[PDB]
């Protein structure tokens, strides 16, 4: 009947992580924290503090084919996970450059801060040296290796101290005195780096004016969405340290569907290029990204809606196959449940029951406003 979560309050994300960086644990913990109400699902519908969060599956190994490019068009932003002991590795770099080519904003989670050899600053520096990435810490860890016990928020200049490995009984305190100057130092570097991404901010910073928290957070957000800045966080997913903070950063800095360039397509009627921006009033257009065989409802086809709205029990056009398709039931797969819905809006992800001739990469769109979307980048 009504759109539950607005476009502004939607986050379509992927987790970019090599198997050594702890992809599965991080994903499992994210699904746990965002699922409050082995088969890995193509996309999980979830929530975090009033925002819709859709976690989209991505490969744990380097993909040099076309399949990688497709998932990058479905997700809007990503969390890149690093093994704090190793920093950026060759495989990590390739994945990072692909994501930059396809303009995917990212926050970086330096995982395994409790492992022997874990070095947050080394990991941060490797982003600059090996990728020329404009990465800046928005946190500094309290301790390292078995002494890793907390995380300092550079924005608020407060600290979280963990008392267990469950993610409960978190003590919110002031920064310990032995880390205050170091925190001040890294916060100054952060302010300076953010100021360098915005002319109006740099003018104020150079003139010595006070940059507010709201202005600093907004600056980080805009630069991150522009793929010209990468906030760096720390934690241990397996020991439930820094997970909630990282999820907060997804909301704070990663893009909503309105923050991304509108998807391009070919209008088959005029034979010219067009776009399908996130607009519930515009004609329906979507991309299928995974075909699943579910052991309950049967053939499920996952899709991402870019424009318009789709009602369950309707007819749409598979513009890639050149034929009309019936959309029966529509489901959204949660971590612990499966919800049936009668309408999917722009920017959301869902799964249609029993679609006959639809495969990954196909455009599903309005019968009256046909378009072929750019799943694979158009030739030139
Ligand atoms: Na994208």
Curated annotation (Swiss-Prot):
<feature type="binding site">
    <location>
        <begin position="17"/>
        <end position="24"/>
    </location>
    <ligand>
        <name>GTP</name>
    </ligand>
</feature>
<dbReference type="GO" id="GO:0032790">
    <property type="term" value="P:ribosome disassembly"/>
</dbReference>
<keyword id="KW-0547">Nucleotide-binding</keyword>
<feature type="domain" description="tr-type G">
    <location>
        <begin position="8"/>
        <end position="258"/>
    </location>
</feature>
<dbReference type="GO" id="GO:0003924">
    <property type="term" value="F:GTPase activity"/>
</dbReference>
<dbReference type="GO" id="GO:0005737">
    <property type="term" value="C:cytoplasm"/>
</dbReference>
<keyword id="KW-0342">GTP-binding</keyword>
<feature type="binding site">
    <location>
        <begin position="111"/>
        <end position="114"/>
    </location>
    <ligand>
        <name>GTP</name>
    </ligand>
</feature>
<comment type="similarity">
    <text>Belongs to the TRAFAC class translation factor GTPase superfamily. Classic translation factor GTPase family. EF-G/EF-2 subfamily.</text>
</comment>
<protein>
    <recommendedName>
        <fullName>Elongation factor G</fullName>
    </recommendedName>
</protein>
<keyword id="KW-0963">Cytoplasm</keyword>
<comment type="function">
    <text>Catalyzes the GTP-dependent ribosomal translocation step during translation elongation. During this step, the ribosome changes from the pre-translocational (PRE) to the post-translocational (POST) state as the newly formed A-site-bound peptidyl-tRNA and P-site-bound deacylated tRNA move to the P and E sites, respectively. Catalyzes the coordinated movement of the two tRNA molecules, the mRNA and conformational changes in the ribosome.</text>
</comment>
<keyword id="KW-0251">Elongation factor</keyword>
<keyword id="KW-0648">Protein biosynthesis</keyword>
<dbReference type="GO" id="GO:0005525">
    <property type="term" value="F:GTP binding"/>
</dbReference>
<dbReference type="GO" id="GO:0003746">
    <property type="term" value="F:translation elongation factor activity"/>
</dbReference>
<feature type="binding site">
    <location>
        <begin position="57"/>
        <end position="61"/>
    </location>
    <ligand>
        <name>GTP</name>
    </ligand>
</feature>
């Amino acid at each position: 009947m009504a759109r539950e979560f607005s476009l502004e309050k939607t986050r379509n994300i992927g987790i970019m992580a090599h198997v050594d960086a702890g992809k599965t644990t991080t994903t499992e913990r994210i699904l746990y924290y965002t699922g409050k109400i082995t088969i890995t699902s193509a996309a999980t519908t979830a929530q975090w503090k009033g925002y819709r969060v859709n976690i989209i599956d991505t490969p744990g190994h380097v993909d040099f084919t076309i399949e990688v490019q497709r998932s990058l068009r479905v997700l809007d932003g990503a969390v890149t996970v690093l093994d704090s002991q190793s920093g950026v590795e060759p495989q990590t770099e390739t994945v990072w450059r692909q994501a930059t080519e396809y303009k995917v904003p990212r926050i970086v989670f330096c995982n395994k801060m409790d492992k022997i050899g874990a070095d947050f600053f080394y990991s941060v520096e490797s982003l600059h040296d090996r990728l020329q990435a404009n990465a800046h810490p928005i946190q500094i860890p309290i301790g390292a290796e078995e002494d890793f016990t907390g995380i300092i928020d550079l924005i608020k200049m407060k600290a979280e101290i963990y008392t267990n490995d469950l993610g409960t009984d978190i003590q919110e305190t002031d920064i310990p005195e032995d880390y205050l100057e170091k925190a001040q130092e890294w916060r100054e570097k952060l302010v300076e780096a953010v100021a360098e991404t915005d002319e109006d901010l740099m003018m104020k910073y150079l003139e010595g004016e006070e940059i507010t928290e709201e202005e600093l957070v907004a600056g980080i957000r805009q630069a991150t969405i522009n793929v010209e800045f990468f906030p760096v966080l720390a934690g241990s997913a397996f020991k439930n340290k820094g997970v909630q903070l990282m999820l907060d950063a997804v909301l704070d800095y990663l893009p909503s569907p309105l923050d991304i360039d509108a998807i391009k397509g070919i209008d088959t009627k005029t034979d010219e290029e067009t776009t399908r921006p996130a607009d519930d009033e515009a004609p329906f257009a979507s991309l299928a990204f995974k075909v699943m065989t579910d052991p309950f409802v049967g053939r499920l086809t996952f899709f991402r809606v870019y424009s318009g709205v789709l009602e369950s029990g309707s007819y749409v056009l598979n513009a890639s196959k050149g034929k009309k398709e019936r959309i029966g039931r529509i489901l959204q797969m949660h971590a612990n449940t499966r919800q049936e819905i009668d309408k999917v809006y722009s920017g959301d992800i869902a799964a249609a029951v029993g679609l006959k001739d639809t495969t990954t990469g196909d455009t599903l769109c309005a019968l009256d406003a046909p378009v072929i979307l750019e799943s694979i980048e158009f030739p030139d």
